[PDB]
Design a protein around this ligand. Sequence first.
Ligand SMILES: ClC1=C(Cl)[C@]2(Cl)[C@@H]3[C@@H](Cl)[C@@H](Cl)C[C@@H]3[C@@]1(Cl)C2(Cl)Cl
Length: 274
Amino acid sequence: GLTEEQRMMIRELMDAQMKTFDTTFSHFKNFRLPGVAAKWSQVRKDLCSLKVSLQLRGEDGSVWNYKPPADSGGKEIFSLLPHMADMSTYMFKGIISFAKVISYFRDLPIEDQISLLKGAAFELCQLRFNTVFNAETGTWECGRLSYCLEDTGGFQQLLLEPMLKFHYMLKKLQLHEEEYVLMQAISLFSPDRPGVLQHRVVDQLQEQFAITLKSYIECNRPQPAHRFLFLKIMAMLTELRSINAQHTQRLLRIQDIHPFATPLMQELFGITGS
Ligand SMILES: ClC1=C(Cl)[C@]2(Cl)[C@@H]3[C@@H](Cl)[C@@H](Cl)C[C@@H]3[C@@]1(Cl)C2(Cl)Cl
């Protein structure tokens, strides 16, 4: 029951997703790995909230496993930062390529493209990561890389971290590929990001992506479990925006006392190099 324009709109987004999302992470390579005063207290809280072990499955059948150190009041809490910087950079590139393929994005002024990507790159990265999240094992399955949440409390204590609660709650909605990519579009075309000039154009595009999503759900999900699903998704996007703001401040705090951001991360977060 979608209109012609809505069916074309979903197809272009699905097309962009297919072309730019390396779902097996086969081209993520050359990444760094861990080696073989009230600020620090806050940075310690910042880093200790998302602790993961790492596994690497070699193409030959070998397996490397990394278990992170406990916080002992030292630099060891930074040991996974270079690797995560490389992974974030890889995802950011796919997100930039995603936006560039979309006609509605490419027709915006170049200054607004940059402002929208700076505002939504993290959110779109999280949305893509959720599609490889395994909620039963607490693992992001990134092809031959796996990131497994470290035990602690149990899961209920882990779900107090908002980013982890977001991933579990979003996964439980059991969304289709089309609903994920419409969420990426609504997030990308947010008219209220810092520096956006064509505010009215972006707002109208966002409204159309949300209408298409509302219509998609109504045409393809009649089950009582999916009542209010559209409103649940919009609430998740509002929460993802809040998480985006928390993560930025948390990144800038860590960067203030222990630099790690790659050049592309610096560009996206307003770090000038000076
Ligand atoms: Cl935190 C955090 C880590 Cl760690 C992972 Cl790998 C990923 C890194 Cl690359 C940044 Cl983009 C934030 C996400 C999450 Cl939420 C996951 Cl777990 Cl997907």
